[PDB]
Design a protein around this ligand. Structure first.
Ligand SMILES: O=C(CN1CCCC1)Nc1ccc(F)cc1
Length: 211
């Protein structure tokens, strides 16, 4: 086992194949402990989950400081934090996976390259190298800074995202809201008038598939 695993891939290869809460250590530093939910089952596992929508109990209409730091219950609905995502994605080359499920239907998207810049970039999104079944709805968002109501699409749709003008992906939108562009949307799967029941965003090293 690795004493200070830096992500869910290093925590897994530590043998632990059960999805749930694990401690990772940013940059392998024992003073940078971070509790994460690891999805150890989806496409070989080793995923840090950083967003989960599943029941609408948690409020995602939250401010810049909340999106920077993270909020919610890692076992239920939560957002891991942009500062955490920046620090994780700085560690090496990460891939993004998005898992969606609505009324029994599933879809996914994988982006071979995924990074989140630091606060001086307003946590700029990089997403490249799409594959999947959900449809490439993050391409629209590539290179965009993060937006909250207090730093306007976030206000206008009551969510938070790497908004452009405004979105094809709104996974931090209003739960169960089927009004145009208000809900948990992935446009190229279910459009703008269908709020998705279940959504997870997760990351792991892009080289995991052959390590
Ligand atoms: O749990 C908190 C609240 N405070 C901050 C530190 C311990 C108590 N925030 C948070 C929640 C979920 C997550 F994924 C990331 C951050």
């Amino acid at each position: 086992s690795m004493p200070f695993p830096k992500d869910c891939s290093q925590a897994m290869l530590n043998g632990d194949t059960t999805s749930g809460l694990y401690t990772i250590y940013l940059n392998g530093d024992k003073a940078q402990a971070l509790e994460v939910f690891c999805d150890m089952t989806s496409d070989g596992g080793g995923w840090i989950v950083f967003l989960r929508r599943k029941n609408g109990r948690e409020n995602f209409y939250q401010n810049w400081k909340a999106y920077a730091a993270g909020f919610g219950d890692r076992r239920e609905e939560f957002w891991l934090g942009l500062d955490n995502l920046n620090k994780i994605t700085a560690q090496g080359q990460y891939e993004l996976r998005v898992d969606l499920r609505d009324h029994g239907e599933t879809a996914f998207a994988v982006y071979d390259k995924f990074s989140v810049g630091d606060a001086k970039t307003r946590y700029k999104l990089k997403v490249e190298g799409y594959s999947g079944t959900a449809g490439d709805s993050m391409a629209y968002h590539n290179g965009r800074s993060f937006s909250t109501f207090d730093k306007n699409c976030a206000l206008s749709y009551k969510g938070a995202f790497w908004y452009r003008n405004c979105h094809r992906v709104n996974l931090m939108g209003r739960y169960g809201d089927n009004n145009h562009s208000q809900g948990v949307n992935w446009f190229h799967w279910k459009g703008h008038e269908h709020s998705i029941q279940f959504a997870e965003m997760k990351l792991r090293p892009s080289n995991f598939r052959n390590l």
